[PDB]
Amino acid sequence: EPIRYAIPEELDRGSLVGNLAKDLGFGVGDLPTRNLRVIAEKKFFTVSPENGNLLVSDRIDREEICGKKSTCVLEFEMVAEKPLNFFHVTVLIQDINDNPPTFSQNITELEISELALTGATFALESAQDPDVGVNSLQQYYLSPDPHFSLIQKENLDGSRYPELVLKAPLDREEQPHHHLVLTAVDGGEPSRSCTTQIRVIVADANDNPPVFTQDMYRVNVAENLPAGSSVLKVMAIDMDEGINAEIIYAFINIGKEVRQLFKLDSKTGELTTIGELDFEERDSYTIGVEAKDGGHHTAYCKVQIDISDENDNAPEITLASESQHIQEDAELGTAVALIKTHDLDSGFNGEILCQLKGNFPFKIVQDTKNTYRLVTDGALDREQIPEYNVTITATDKGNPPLSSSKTITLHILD
């Protein structure tokens, strides 16, 4: 007694579903006398009491009725009169591919670090299709990109979902963004399609250690350099981004001799002096510099600071004599006093020229480069001149030249 029909959805009003009169043993000779009607909470079908045909009266949208059910059937009752009887009529609504696939968003972003190995799989969002059956099964295609490809797997129910695969390593320092296009095409007639853009943001990874612009920082300064003066500036380049590019500079393998003399900026890398340079104490400094980032990648270089000799030391004079006593009967050339000179500076700043300032019966006789001898070159007499105030002046050959004066009293004994 029950009867089932099968019509496609989205049929215009008046489309023939079937002949309920012919298909139930109802002769037309008593059709209007039985008043064939259709009772239903949702009025989707009507019956013409003239011929007994079951037609449609409203829009039959399968997605509004059943949704995503595999089978969409409608069960209503038909009422006849004289006598009153019920006729259960089932109507299976067939699904047509009238709805295209849709992604949740037109543009989707994905963050992938540079450390993604070749072959890494990244999950993608599947497209939804309001239809069922073959009109809902999707085929996913990715636009050709030399870095990314697409693999398509199936679930247990047969539904297909895309997954992004990496076929080329990602280098943010070469290309931080990748624009892909994913297209979902269902397997119905006609084949409806939709596209979406995938913005792949290459996340930074600490894979580039710091690199100094110079493997050796060699500079020459003077020892009279004041404290705090700028000596040089080391520079390191880190091609990464953010914390993986911030560089801190610091000294390594250093001692208190150099720690109390120089200062390295932890941010700008400027090398200054916190102490006093002295060419006589140390003429060359070799310091190791460390460049470290957030990823603990270290870079090492050496800095050599040369110091020039400045004429900041005056020649001192050392004298010696036989209790600074001279016999008035001494012969010409008798050693009266011994002179020793030395200058702490090097080069021509250390060479000394000793002079005899004044007019005395003596003369300077050079023996070595630093030892002089004061001999007699005139007559002596206690009752005439009892004492001589001999002044010795030694001047270096630097620029500006410095000198010192050493006066010794030489008594004349009888």
Residues within the interface to Ca ion (CB under 5 A): 61-63, 95, 97-99, 129, 131, 135, 171, 173, 186, 204-208, 223, 238, 240, 244, 278-280, 293, 309, 311-313, 343, 345, 349, 396
Beta bridge partners of 151: 163
Judged by CB under 8 A, does residue 89 bind its own copies?
A: no
Which residue from 25, 27, 83, 228 is in contact with its own copies, where contact means CB under 8 A? 83
Which of the choices Ca ion, its own copies, none does residue 138 contact, using the CB cut-off of 5 to 8 A by kind? none
The reply to whether 81 sits near its own copies by the rule CB under 8 A is yes
Token readout for 2 is 């029950």
For residue 172, give both structure tokens: 């943010």
Minimum separation from the CB atom of position 297 to its own copies (A): 9
Q: Does 165 bind its own copies (CB under 8 A)?
A: no
Binder of its own copies out of 133, 187, 295, 401 (CB under 8 A): 295
Single out the residue of 94, 90, 93, 92 nearest to residue 23, CA to CA.
Answer: 90
Which 3-state string (H, E, C) describes 350-412?
A: CCEEEEEECCCCEEEEECCCCEEEEEECCCCCCCCCCEEEEEEEEEECCCCCCEEEEEEEEEE
Q: Does 88 engage in binding with its own copies (CB under 8 A)?
A: yes
- Judged by CB under 8 A, which of 7, 11, 37, 61 binds its own copies? 37
Question: Minimum distance from CB of 183 to Ca ion (Å)?
Answer: 14
- Considering beta carbons, is residue 224 or 334 the nearer one to its own copies? 334
User: What distance, in Å, lies between the first and last C-alpha atoms of the chain?
Assistant: 169
Which residues ranging from 182 to 211 are in contact with its own copies (CB under 8 A)? 203
How is residue 77 annotated by DSSP?
Answer: E
Number of H helices, E strands in the chain: 2, 31
Integer Cα distance of 260 and 273 in angstroms:
9
Does 86 contact its own copies by CB under 8 A? yes
CB 58 within 8 A of CB 44: yes
- Find, among 259, 389, 388, 404, the residue nearest to 318 by Cα: 404
CB 316 within 8 A of CB 392: no
* Interaction of residue 314 with its own copies, rule CB under 8 A: no
Q: Which stretch binds its own copies (CB under 8 A): 78-86, 181-189, 210-218, 357-365?
A: 78-86
> Residue 84 or 216: which CB sits closer to its own copies?
84
Q: Which stretch binds its own copies (CB under 8 A): 82-90, 208-216, 219-227, 405-413?
A: 82-90
DSSP state of 339: E
We find the least distance from the C-beta atom of residue 301 to its own copies, in angstroms, to be 12
126 binds its own copies (CB under 8 A): yes
340 binds its own copies (CB under 8 A): yes
